[PDB]
Amino acid sequence: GSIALPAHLRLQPIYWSRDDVAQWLKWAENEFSLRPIDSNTFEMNGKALLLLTKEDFRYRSPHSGDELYELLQHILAQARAAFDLYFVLDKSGSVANNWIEIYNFVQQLAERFVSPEMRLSFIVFSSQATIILPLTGDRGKISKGLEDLKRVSPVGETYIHEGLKLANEQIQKAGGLKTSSIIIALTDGKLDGLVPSYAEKEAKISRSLGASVYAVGVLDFEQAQLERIADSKEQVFPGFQALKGII
Ligand SMILES: [Mg+2]
């Protein structure tokens, strides 16, 4: 249901290392007030920990083990529902008064993904890219980020490449194992200069990092432009909140 899985362990246990298994034993010892667990109990990586039976956890950890085994089974279920969302919001002068629709789309979509493993990140761009909310799962920090999204004044030009770059850097910091990273862009496709060339180039970098690029058209949007940023035409939509919740 709800596991207080910290950083460096948010990834799937199959992608863990030997130091991550030790960090998992140190976290579980204080989270569940377990007996002093020796660090040399599970001298193996994450892939080898998934092959052991529950009787092996009892042998290596007589006091716990059964708790460490069942906790690993719940963490595997948390990783299946784990997902990283990135909201790329266009705060340029092109959206103007339509920024209320961008805020309502993010607010209504944030009220649905209430899972503890669901982490959100707010990145607005408009002649400058600034990550308002870093990637976190704390609902209090997300509610703080939502209020700051309303504090945004639509001023600047459209430069999606700089906004998608900050999203890919967070995906790069999470790594390719965080394939559940999803980028949700809320723009109007009103690009100028070589930005159409850099927006499609930066989008391919997101695809190389194992991320899905979803585009949300606001007011008027060049469909041919957003289909090149997104993976396909199906991932482009102006209902739409349910479509984002389904995929
Ligand atoms: Mg603009």
Author numbering: 1 to 238, 242 to 250
Task: Quote the original article.
The ‘TELSAM’ variant of the human translocation ETS leukaemia (TEL) protein sterile alpha motif (SAM) domain is a 75-amino-acid (9 kDa) polymer-forming crystallization chaperone that is soluble at pH > 8. However, when the pH decreases below 7, TELSAM forms a six-subunit-per-turn helical polymer that can enable fused target proteins to co-crystallize. TELSAM reduces the entropic cost of crystal nucleation and growth by pre-freezing some degrees of freedom in the crystal lattice.
The batch 2 crystals that diffracted X-rays were obtained in 100 mM sodium acetate pH 4.6, 2.0 M sodium formate. One of these crystals diffracted to 3.3 Å resolution. Taken together, these data suggest that the vWa domains in this crystal may adopt at least six different orientations (one in chain A, at least two in chain B and at least three in chain C). An alternative possibility is that interaction with the PGM drug molecule may have partially misfolded the chain B and C vWa domains or disordered their positions in the crystal. In this scenario, the chain B vWa domain may still be partially resolved because it interacts with two copies of chain A vWa domains from two distinct 32-axis polymers. However, no clear sign of PGM was detected in the electron density. We were able to refine this model to only relatively poor R work and R free values of 0.28 and 0.31, respectively, which diminishes confidence in the space-group assignment and molecular-replacement solution. The interface of the chain A vWa domain with the chain B vWa domain buries 99 Å2 of solvent-accessible surface area and is more polar. Specifically, the side and main chains of Leu219 and Asp220 of the chain A vWa domain make hydrophobic and van der Waals interactions with Arg139, Gly140 and Ser143 of the chain B vWa domain. Nevertheless, the multiple observed binding modes in this crystal establish that the vWa domain can stably adopt multiple binding modes and that doing so does not abolish useful X-ray diffraction.
